[PDB]
């Protein structure tokens, strides 16, 4: 059943990836809209610095959340493929997965 299981896993990984890409695109467009709005209004060259640092921090956050989910997936799959008796599984979360 390895072929079917790996197919399902690959599709799930791609689902995480495409969702991350959508979220990050949305947040990048929102950052550009907010910068344009600050430009239309009183444009403080430091307030736009604040909002750009905030946008980039949020994008780091989305990317890193999606990345930790992808890595969790990776460890699930490599553990199942290399599974063997006497193997110790310490993470309750990974074991229930």
- CB 52, CB 32: distance < 8 Å: no
- CB 24, CB 48: distance < 8 Å: no
Please tell me what DSSP assigns to residue 85: T
- CB 38, CB 47: distance < 8 Å: yes
Please tell me what DSSP assigns to residue 43: -
Q: What six digits make up the tokens of 24?
A: 């990050």
Q: Dihedral (C-alpha) 14, 20, 22, 28: value to the nearest 10 degrees?
A: -150
- CB 61, CB 24: distance < 8 Å: no
Distance CA 54, CA 26 (A): 15
Distance CA 43, CA 12 (A): 43
Distance CA 21, CA 9 (A): 18
Distance CA 38, CA 86 (A): 61
Q: What six digits make up the tokens of 20?
A: 């991350």
Q: Is 44 helix (H, G, I), strand (E, B) or coil?
A: coil
Alpha helix positions (H), 1-97: 2-40, 47-81, 92-96
- Technique employed here was X-ray
- CB 27, CB 55: distance < 8 Å: yes
């Amino acid at each position: 059943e390895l072929s079917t299981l790996e197919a399902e896993m690959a599709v799930e990984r791609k689902a995480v990836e495409d969702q991350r890409d959508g979220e990050l695109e949305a947040r990048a467009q929102k950052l550009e809209a907010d910068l344009a709005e600050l430009e239309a209004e009183g444009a403080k060259a430091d307030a736009r610095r604040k909002v750009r640092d905030g946008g980039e921090r949020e994008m780091r956050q989305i990317r890193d959340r999606a990345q930790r989910e992808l890595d969790r997936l990776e460890d699930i799959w490599s553990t199942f493929t290399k599974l063997a008796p006497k193997q110790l599984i310490v993470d309750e979360n990974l074991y229930r997965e």
